[PDB]
Every structure is written in C-alpha cells, then in structure tokens.
C-alpha cells in the first residue's frame, strides 16, 4: 500500500561536529522541510498458508538524500539498496543489517532478488527464519567492502507501547554517505508525533556514485500485520514505514545550554519563519 | 585594542599589522575622545550647581508631596522611589566593575570602561538640584541660594504665566491635591507601561549590538582559508601565510574602522541630545521657561530632574487650562 | 612607556592609556593520540600495476603516524604542487581521514587535475572539488611503460552523457549511442566504444608521455583525528597559562576541568568567534575548557612631568589579588617588573590602582580615574594621591513657612565664553 | 618601479593605492564629523550673538551665569569670544514673609 | 541590496560574498535606521496638534 | 566569470566585491552624517514650529 501524512517538525540533525551552547547558529544544508508530505509504503507478503505473489516493493526515487522512519519490532526492516537499476551495467551500493553487524558494500549486482518466500511464513504459528539471505548471487567487477557495527541498536521496553522511531537520514554529497540516526522510543501510536528531536551521525564514507534509485530490504520470511487495499492519492494505509525527501534549505537552530538542539526554524517556510 | 582584537596573541600578525601605520593609533585616540566626551556630558548636564544643598529634616512644603522625588534614607542607594523605578526598569549590559556570558565572550580587547560619575553621586547632583529648586526657587540658578516658602514660589511661577497670585493663594489645597495625584500616578503610568524608557534602552542596546557584531566579525574568513589566525600560521608557510594574514588584517581593520565611525556618529548624536538636556536642565529646572512646548505641554510651571541609566528624566509640572465658557467680547 | 606611546619628552598632567599587560605562557604542551604503528607507503607507490584513470585506485589511510620525510626518494616528483596545507608544514598536523587516489594520465592533462578545471578528464574521468584541500604529485613513468610493439593495458573515457560530480567513479562496460541507431553490441557502423587505449613506446615525444599522478586528499576538519605527525606528546598541565597544541590545534591559555556534555561524535568546542573554547584530550577523552590568559589594559597616571617623575599604574577591570600583587620574572609582558608590590596598592571599582594611596579626605579632583575615584599630586614628602572626588561644598538652606532671604546688594560680573565658529579649510 | 617589473609592480602599486585611498577616506570622514560638530558650535554661536548680543535674553544660564544683562562679541582665530556682563545678587537678609 | 548591487544574479558570487560575514546586514540596518528616522522627522515637526 | 576558471576567478571576484562594498560603505557613511545634518534641522524646525 501507500499513503500520505504530515512530517511536522522532524528530521533535523547536527550539521557539524563542533560543540555549541546557548547559541542561535544557522546552517545551510540538505534538510527535510517542515510540514511536508511523507509517503508511507507497506510490503504485503502473506496470505494464509499460500504464496500468493504480491509484486510489491516498487522503485523509490532517491534525490538529495532521503529520510527514513519505521517502527519495527525486532528486525523486520533490514537494510537499503542504492544505485541505478540494479543491473550489470552500473555499480550500486547495498546496505543490509545483521544480528550484530553491518556489511554495506559496493558492487555490480546482476541480480540479488531471492526473498525465499516460505510455505509457512505466517508469524502467528511460527517465525522460523535463520540466515535467509540468498544474496550477492553474482559480482562482475566488485572489490569494495566495508564492515562495522550495525546502525540500529534495537532496545525493547518489554511491551509494545515504547515503539522505536529509527529516524535515519542518507546524503550523497561528494560521496561521504552520512547516516545520521537517533532512537526516540517516546512513541505512543501517533504517527510522527508533535515535538522535536535531533539526529547524530553514525558513519561517514566516500565511494562516488549517482544513485537515482532507492528501495528497502525486509525479512520477508517472517512478516505480519500487512493490510492491503487500493488506497492512493492522499489517502490512508498502515505501513509503519516512512519516506521523506530532502532539499537544500536554511535552518536556524537553537542549541541548548546542555549542548543539545531544542528548536529549529525553516528559512524557506511561511514568511514569519 | 588593535593589538589583541585584530591579531590574537601572535607576534607575526602584530608585526604585519605594524606596517599599516596609524590605522590603529587613530582608532584609540578617537575612542578615548569619545570616552572623555561622555565623561564631560554628565558633568555638563548635572554638575550645574557649585554646592550641594540638602532639604530640611522636616518635610512640609504647604501640602505639596515631594516624597516621591526626594531621596529616601532607608534605601541603601539613597535614591528616590521614582529614581529606583527608573533604575529597575532599565537594565544595563556592562559597566566594567572588576570583571577580572556574552560580555565574558569579549576576550578580544573590547573593554567597557566605567563612567567617571557613579550613579550614587549623580543621584547627589539630582538631590542637590531638586532641593535647591524646592527650597530656593530659581534664585540658586543665578547667584547665592535665597530661601523662599514653596507656596510663594508656586504663586510666582503662576505669575510668570500670566495668572495672578490670588489663584494659588485661594486654591492652594486644590493645586496641592492635583500635584500630589499627578506625582502619584506618574509612577504608576511609568511602571505599568511595557516600555516607557525606550530611548535609554535603545541607547544601551545599540552599543550592545555594535559590540556583539564586532565580536562576530572574527568568525568571517574575509576571503581567507579560515577565520582563525592560529590555524593559518599552523597550516601555511610564511610566504602564503603573509598574504592570508594580510587579508584578515584588511577585513578586521575595515570592520573596526566601520565600528569606530558608527561610534563617532552615535556619539555626536548623543552629544547633541546631552546639550539639549543641559539646556533643558538650565532653563526648565533652574528657572521658568516661556518657550512653548519646550518644558512639556502647556504653560510651564517647573521641572524636577531624575537620574536614569545613561540618561535623565524630566518631570515637567505644567499648567493646562480646563473647562471653558463662551463670552461676548469687544 | 608614556613618553614612547606619544612622541614627546614632556607629558602633561593626566591619565594616559599606554599598553596592555597579559600573563605570558610558561611552558608549551603537545598532546596527540598515542599511536605506535606506522602506515606504510612503499606499497602505495612502489607498485608497477596501478589502475587507469576512469577507475583510479583509492587507498584510505588509517591510524598511524604520517612522517612524510622519507618518501621524496620513491619517485622523481616532477611536480609537488599542493593546495590547502603548505607542502613543508605537513608533519605537524593531524587529519581526520586521508585518501590517496592514484592513477596515470597523459602529460598534457596533468595541469587539468586541479579544482575547478574543464576538459576531457576534469568533466568525464575524474573531477576534483572546488574546495579541494590536499596535495597533487606527478612524475614520469616511461622507464617501464614502453614496448617495442605496444602496451595495450591502460584506458580512459572519452564520451559521457553528462559531467560527473567530484570524486565519483564511473566504471561502465556500456556501448555509447553514436548517431541515431540504438545498436545493442554490434559495435560496427556508427557505434564506437567510448574508451580509447594507451599503447605507449619510447618513440613518442614529450607531453604525450604517461604522467603517473597521485592526489592525497585530507579532510582537515573538526573530528577525532586518525592520522597524525611524528610528535612526542607531553604531560597535561591544568589551571596554569601554557601553550597547547591539542591534536593540531595551537593556542594559548589555561586548561581547566570542564563540566560540558561533549557527545561522542564531537571533538571541539566553539563560542561565537569561530575560535575553540573547549576540547577533549586526544589520549584521555576528558573534556577540558580553554580560557585565555589573564590580560587587561594599563593606564599611567602622571602629574606634570616638570613636577615629578613618579607615576601611578592602573590595571583596568582587574582584581589584582592575581599576579600583579605577586609578580616574578618572565611572567608579565611589561619588562618593568621592579615594583615591591607590597605597599600603595588600592583596589578601585575600575580595577586596582598601584603607586597611589587612598585617603578618607575628599577634594575636587584633577586627574580622573573612574568609578568616582580621582588622583592628584599632594604633599605630606610628596606623592600621588587617590581619593573619592568631592562633588561640592555641602551646605544647607533655611527653609521655613514664613522666611524669605532677600539680597540687599548686587554685582556686575563679566564672565567669558569661547565658541569655535570655523576650522581650517583643506583641499586635497 | 625601478626594482620590480610591471607584472608584479602593478599589483604592489594597486595595494599601495588601496592603502593610501583608505587613509584619505578616513581623513575625509573624520573631517566631515569634525565639520558637523563645528557647524553645531557655530549655530550655537550665531544664536548667542543673535540673542545675548542683539538683545537681552530671558533664558537662564544661557548668556553667562546669573541674570543676563548684556554681551560683547570678540573675534578670535577660528572662533568667537562672548563677554557676558551679568547681574548676580549679593549679601542677603532674612525676612518674615506673609 | 548587497545581493544585487555587489553580486549581480551570480550564485557563485553570492556564495563568495557570505565569506565577508554579517557585514552589510549592518548596512541594511544602518539605512533602515535612517529611513525610520525620516518618518519620525516629518512627524515631530508637523504632528504638534 | 565566463573568461576565468573558478580557481583564479574567486581571487578576482573578491577584488570587485571588496571595492563595491567599500564604495557602498562610503554611501552609507555619507548618509549617516547627512541624516544628522537633516535631523539637526528637523529638530530646529520642530522647535521653531
Ligand atoms: C503623601 O505624603 C504622605 C505623608 O506625608 C505619604 O503617606 C505615607 O506614605 C507611605 C509611603 O508609601 C505609606 O507607606 C503610608 O501608608 C502613608 N501614610 C498615609 C497616612 O497615607 C503618602 O504616601 C504621600 N503620597 C504618595 C503618593 O506617596
Ligand atoms: C538667618 O539666615 C541664616 C542663613 O542665611 C540662618 O543661619 C543658619 O540657620 C540655620 C537654621 O536654623 C541654623 O541651623 C544655623 O545654625 C544658622 N547658622 C548660623 C551660623 O547661626 C539663620 O538661622 C537665620 N535667622 C536668623 C535669626 O539669623
Ligand atoms: C554693595 O557692595 C559694594 C561693593 O563695592 C559696596 O561699595 C563699597 O562700599 C564701601 C563702603 O562705603 C567702600 O569702602 C568701597 O570702596 C565700595 N566699593 C567700591 C568698588 O566702590 C557698597 O557699599 C555695597 N552697598 C551696600 C548697600 O552695602
Ligand atoms: C487451498 C489449496 O488447495 N491449497 C494448496 C494445498 O492444498 C496444497 O497441499 C499445497 C501444496 O501443493 O498448495 C496449496
Ligand atoms: C556475518 C555474520 O556475522 N553473520 C552472523 C553469523 O556469523 C551468525 O552465526 C548468525 C547467528 O545469529 O548471525 C549472522
Ligand atoms: C493446529 C496445529 O497446530 N497444527 C500443526 C501442529 O500439529 C504441528 O505440531 C505444528 C508444527 O510444529 O504445525 C501446526
Ligand atoms: C577486472 C576484472 O575483475 N575482470 C574480470 C574478468 O577478468 C573475468 O573474465 C570476468 C568473468 O566474469 O569477470 C571480470
Ligand atoms: C555512477 C552512476 O550511478 N551512473 C549512472 C549512469 O550509469 C546511468 O546511465 C544514469 C542514468 O541512466 O544514472 C547514473
Ligand atoms: C539529563 C537531562 O535530561 N537533564 C539534565 C539534568 O538531569 C541535570 O540535573 C542537569 C545538570 O547539569 O543537566 C541536565
Ligand atoms: C500532499 O500531496 C497531496 C496530493 O498528492 C496534496 O493534496 C497535499 O496538499 C500535499 N500535502 C502538503 C503538505 O503539501
Ligand atoms: C594510550 O594510553 C592509554 C593510557 O593508559 C592506554 O590505555 C592506551 O592503550 C594507549 N594507546 C594505545 C594505542 O596503546
Ligand atoms: C621497488 O623497490 C625495489 C627494491 O627492492 C626495486 O628493486 C624496484 O625497482 C622498485 N620499484 C619501482 C617501481 O621503483
Ligand atoms: C615646570 O616647573 C618649573 C618650576 O621649577 C618651571 O621652571 C618649568 O617651566 C615648568 N615646566 C612646565 C612644562 O610646566
Ligand atoms: C576581588 O578581590 C577581593 C579582595 O578580597 C575579593 O574580596 C573579591 O571577592 C574578589 N572578587 C572577584 C570577582 O574576584
Ligand atoms: C577612614 O575611615 C574609616 C571608617 O570610615 C576608619 O576606620 C579609618 O581609620 C579612617 N582612616 C584611614 C583609613 O586612614
Ligand atoms: C509650618 O506649619 C505647619 C503647620 O502644621 C507646622 O507643622 C510646621 O512645623 C511649620 N514649619 C515650621 C518650620 O515651623
């Protein structure tokens, strides 16, 4: 499915790595503008005890970075794919998470689509899903690799009330992929809650590719809660998966006395701003 | 200080700046002249009396209530209640009082010297002027102070505006009550108004913002690789550090010259205002002025000066006509 | 000093601002992360199988000590043109991350590997950003890049649909759409491959000889440093004015224990001057605050130079329980540290005054000082005197209900006033 | 010019011209501010010559300390000097007033 | 306007002008201070009633 | 800008900016002094009225 919502005041990160306090320092960089459409997307791969091909996961454009926000239980959303058309003509980037690892790399994947749909993929009865990768099938001219700590540090409150909001920001300015992230488990069920939060960087690394393309990876061997309908064109549909598009804007940031970011003003919004 | 502002604790930058000549002795001389001018302005406005007069310990002026403008000995600062309200309503940014957060962010040679006259002796000038004008009329503005009962002085201030003495001597209770009510309500109107001392607050805030902007100029590259000169001297060889440091010299010196010129123009405007205030104190307070709309609106009666942070406040007691009647005249 | 600040051997009575005092640093300290391993460069340069230019080989260099003083003999180094940091002053800096992008190109194109350049190689093969900071090194490679018949090994890119953003690889085994026919691998008429080779022989002349070029790009920015120069770090000193070289950041001041909340990705502090205020110790990971050394302006109060030659020094806005009261050699910028600093020290709200003594008695004052304090020159046998100025002769009036004072005489006084009307007319 | 060649001589001379032009700008600006101050002083002097000299001024503490009587102008290099002859009271007596 | 008078519709000039800091933001404030004062000048002279 | 590469244009654009800004600063300084001249006359007119 797919649906629209309001971003409110979310998606602002620390632009630089210096420390500031009680200052109104302003920046000009790629940001997510306040009060803009954020489009949900849901992957629906379950039907009784039958395969029932769904042909989900269309191609999402990637321009000037992308903002991500999902509320997954443990590992429903694994990683992301960056590149162009995923063919053995142009090189592309691959992000995929692990139990405690991340193996993001750059290759020339001819094909890496083998979700391994299960005959008993229904999560209520069982969730038998171990090493269901079936990836990196081919590599024509591929030598770049990188392994480090996983981006997402999933924390459980032993109940479903404190759902994590794994806000991520991806940028492609002269290589140097920025993966700003912060976990905000203050969620109570309302999408993109009223309030304010910041994002801290995780890893910075240059490769050099264009990336007019973006999709996500899910652990399809264990999935549930995927309602399906014909909602589109400014409608509603449950996804637990958000995508927003960044543009080069100017932000006025109010650093707290402790050192955190308390508020921000978009300089390309309404004339009062 | 050029030595520390333009160049931060670096011998090479100071030596390079020394080539520019008198672009910094001129700035120090201009700022010293401005400071001396501001020291002279307060003396011109307030120090108009050769001596200092004190009111008698008894406070009876024919029903006139002056308790709101005389100093209160109970208060630690020995200031009038209206003076205390003025002091509370205007907040100063800096005063240079043995400093040894934004003001603390001026480790850049930007020092605010303290005024010559503390606001404890300026209050003494105000008290002396007001005591002279309540206990001697205008006689102390010409020669020796000559005592005179306040009802007689007020009757003659009436006689100055073309109303005979008998009006006051037959309505003295009414004039006393009206003046007391006006003095009582001027404090209430002054306090309740969100911003009545706008001019002095603007005077303080203009200097505060000028110093703030001058501080922020150090974060400007001015076409150089970096806006901090300790990095250029540790990132570039002397042949190119010369050019980059010179570019920073030009930028910071131009900003400082702009600041000094703006300070000169602002000080000229403030000197004009201070000369107007001195004339107003000489004429409205040490005498009665027949100039229309000079000492307040209406037929001027008298005036009381009050000190305020970087300024003066005149309380103009004036005579305004009231309900009128037509008459057939020839 | 007063006679020197304004050109005169006579100084009139008054107060003059001469210079500033500031506590000088005692000893310098350097603190770099303790790194013992060395990042090798032999395999970076001594290798005969470097890649071509459309796919240049990029080597990230990591935690090590970059002693760039022994590499000058690993290549001829025809050109060592470097931007940003000057080439010589590289061994005394710390970088966040350094990348060596190596390749070999045609000689005429060596000047084209530079920020903001246009052409075949700076638009379609390898573009360098406008704000590039780093070094570029180029030399010849004809000693081995030569065959009697040909060297069909190296390649580059002629045609690209659009110019590529700086620092991007564009490996693509695709066939360009020459003309209008969308051929699918025929590679015949109106379909030519978008890359041409570098067969090379010693017969070819200068300019077309292969120039091997390696660029080293470093992000000299605020971050936990990874590669550093060969400097032996010293011990840390606190609450004492010193010169610090914290992880490549040089400065002067006092380092104090700080209670800030530096997040793990932050390494430097900042206030509103673009100057560092706080910094974490690179080999201790403790947040320490930098405060610039004690300083202030000095004013010299002199009577008439014909009257006496003794002066009174005022430190503006300084509480001189600090080093002015206990001064020692090589601690203050003014070399005149000859005061006993035990007598005639008076504290003023405009900073303490030394060389003059306060007295309870009050007069009208000649030399202004500030904060209600003034100075003069008085007898007992003679000294510079400091006192609160006397506003006027305190007196009283005789106000009463029925008392009026009437003068019986007068005086005709002829005062004088002086007013400028014009200045000199100047033309230039 | 004699020691250097035009390719760098023009650059250095341009720098020197910029410096000297900035110095002249500063001189002109200071002269303008001083001229404004002197014009204010000259307006005050003209007012004093119009009121104190060409008449008797009822303004107090304007034409000299004390009650103003009369004034005399005198020329001086780049200025004027006013001799304000004024009336000032003297020895006084107490009196019971009604 | 610095963004037109100094640099005329040139993005690579406007970006380079920012390196001079908040320099002519004072100029906008300085000229606005004059312009605001002018409306006060013609008001205190005439609006005496 | 069309006759120079970004490397040596920035140093050349800076020459134009530092001149136009200097000529723009002079205009503001003249206006500020001229404003005080008018304000002195405006104050006189207000006093004269
Ligand atoms: C008028 O004068 C009288 C006394 O002469 C003042 O009366 C006292 O003022 C103090 C100060 O506020 C009060 O605390 C007392 O309660 C007042 N007593 C009485 C009996 O009124 C009076 O305040 C003066 N008027 C004003 C406006 O201050
Ligand atoms: C006459 O006027 C003089 C002052 O011009 C008065 O002298 C002082 O008056 C006060 C008021 O009581 C006394 O405290 C002082 O002691 C007086 N001074 C001296 C030197 O005696 C004087 O009181 C007035 N009355 C008379 C009758 O002389
Ligand atoms: C007013 O003061 C003048 C001051 O000069 C007095 O004139 C003096 O009077 C004495 C006494 O006769 C003479 O010895 C002096 O020679 C006079 N001075 C001059 C300059 O002539 C005058 O007497 C005083 N008037 C009154 C009424 O006391
Ligand atoms: C509803 C239905 O027929 N479901 C079929 C099931 O009967 C069969 O056993 C299985 C494997 O072939 O495929 C599915
Ligand atoms: C690359 C990597 O570490 N993969 C791990 C694997 O070693 C481990 O056995 C498995 C069990 O959770 O999880 C995954
Ligand atoms: C109703 C039900 O639970 N049916 C089966 C159960 O018999 C079996 O044991 C399990 C496999 O673990 O799969 C399911
Ligand atoms: C640069 C490189 O890796 N080239 C290889 C090529 O030698 C090999 O024949 C081909 C087989 O698929 O894969 C690719
Ligand atoms: C480095 C990279 O991703 N390059 C691709 C290019 O191969 C492709 O032709 C273009 C759109 O077709 O998108 C971009
Ligand atoms: C951690 C937090 O949310 N707020 C803290 C507060 O608990 C602490 O008392 C204060 C002292 O610096 O700093 C802030
Ligand atoms: C989001 O898009 C819909 C249609 O696609 C539009 O009606 C709506 O106004 C958009 N929201 C915002 C905040 O622009
Ligand atoms: C640097 O010194 C600290 C101090 O004990 C030590 O813990 C650390 O291991 C040292 N660094 C290395 C790379 O050994
Ligand atoms: C690399 O070093 C070895 C020394 O063992 C030398 O023989 C060889 O020629 C060097 N290679 C190049 C390309 O200089
Ligand atoms: C200083 O005083 C002496 C008196 O002994 C005098 O001769 C000399 O002219 C005076 N000089 C100055 C400059 O006042
Ligand atoms: C200044 O020094 C005096 C000397 O005793 C001391 O009492 C006072 O606390 C000090 N104040 C500051 C701000 O250092
Ligand atoms: C000055 O006055 C104080 C109290 O006002 C007194 O204790 C002291 O002895 C006097 N003399 C001095 C300080 O020489
Ligand atoms: C004036 O008269 C009042 C009448 O109440 C009296 O209280 C006061 O003491 C008198 N003044 C003098 C100085 O005697």
UniProtKB/Swiss-Prot annotation, chain A:
Changing residue 43 to V: In strain: Eta/B.1.525, Omicron/BA.1. It comes from the Viruses. Disulfide bonds join 107-142. Changing residue 229 to N: In strain: Lambda/C.37. Residues 43-56, 118-140, 149-161, 222-238 are annotated as: Disordered. Residues 1-273 form the BetaCoV S1-NTD domain. Glycans are attached at residues 37, 50, 98, 125, 141, 210, 258. Residues 256-273 are annotated as: Putative superantigen. Attaches the virion to the cell membrane by interacting with host receptor, initiating the infection. The major receptor is host ACE2. When S2/S2' has been cleaved, binding to the receptor triggers direct fusion at the cell membrane. When S2/S2' has not been cleaved, binding to the receptor results in internalization of the virus by endocytosis using host TFRC and GRM2 and leading to fusion of the virion membrane with the host endosomal membrane. Alternatively, may use NRP1/NRP2 and integrin as entry receptors. Binds to host ACE2. RBD also interacts with the N-linked glycan on 'Asn-90' of ACE2. Cleavage of S generates a polybasic C-terminal sequence on S1 that binds to host Neuropilin-1 (NRP1) and Neuropilin-2 (NRP2) receptors. Interacts with host integrin alpha-5/beta-1 (ITGA5:ITGB1) and with ACE2 in complex with integrin alpha-5/beta-1 (ITGA5:ITGB1). May interact via cytoplasmic c-terminus with M protein. May interact (via N-terminus) with host bilirubin and biliverdin, thereby preventing antibody binding to the SARS-CoV-2 spike NTD via an allosteric mechanism. This is Spike protein S1. It comes from Severe acute respiratory syndrome coronavirus 2 (2019-nCoV). The gene is S.
Swiss-Prot record, chain B:
Residues 201-245 form a coiled coil. Residues 80-100 are annotated as: Fusion peptide 1. The record marks 79-80 as: Cleavage. It comes from the Viruses. Residues 172-222 are annotated as: Heptad repeat 1. Disulfide bonds join 2-24, 7-13, 284-295. Glycans are attached at residues 65, 326. Changing residue 234 to A: In strain: Alpha/B.1.1.7. Precursor of the fusion protein processed in the biosynthesis of the S protein and the formation of virus particle. Mediates fusion of the virion and cellular membranes by functioning as a class I viral fusion protein. Contains two viral fusion peptides that are unmasked after cleavage. The S2/S2' cleavage occurs during virus entry at the cell membrane by host TMPRSS2 or during endocytosis by host CSTL. This is Spike protein S2. It comes from Severe acute respiratory syndrome coronavirus 2.
Swiss-Prot record, chain C:
Changing residue 155 to R: In strain: Delta/B.1.617.2, Epsilon/B.1.427/B.1.429, Kappa/B.1.617.1, Lambda/C.37, 19B/501Y, Omicron/BA.4, Omicron/BA.5, Omicron/BQ.1.1; Contributes to cellular immunity evasion and increases infectivity. Disulfide bonds join 39-64, 82-135, 94-228, 183-191, 241-293, 320-352, 365-374. Attaches the virion to the cell membrane by interacting with host receptor, initiating the infection. The major receptor is host ACE2. When S2/S2' has been cleaved, binding to the receptor triggers direct fusion at the cell membrane. When S2/S2' has not been cleaved, binding to the receptor results in internalization of the virus by endocytosis using host TFRC and GRM2 and leading to fusion of the virion membrane with the host endosomal membrane. Alternatively, may use NRP1/NRP2 and integrin as entry receptors. Changing residue 189 to V: In strain: Omicron/BA.4, Omicron/BA.5, Omicron/BQ.1.1. This is Spike protein S1. Residues 140-211 are annotated as: Receptor-binding motif. Residues 106-108 are annotated as: Integrin-binding motif. Changing residue 156 to F: In strain: B.1.1.298. The gene is S. Binds to host ACE2. RBD also interacts with the N-linked glycan on 'Asn-90' of ACE2. Cleavage of S generates a polybasic C-terminal sequence on S1 that binds to host Neuropilin-1 (NRP1) and Neuropilin-2 (NRP2) receptors. Interacts with host integrin alpha-5/beta-1 (ITGA5:ITGB1) and with ACE2 in complex with integrin alpha-5/beta-1 (ITGA5:ITGB1). May interact via cytoplasmic c-terminus with M protein. May interact (via N-terminus) with host bilirubin and biliverdin, thereby preventing antibody binding to the SARS-CoV-2 spike NTD via an allosteric mechanism. Changing residue 250 to K: In strain: Omicron/BA.1. The chain holds residues 298 to 736 of 1273 of the full protein. Residues 22-38, 158-193, 222-244, 324-343 are annotated as: Disordered.
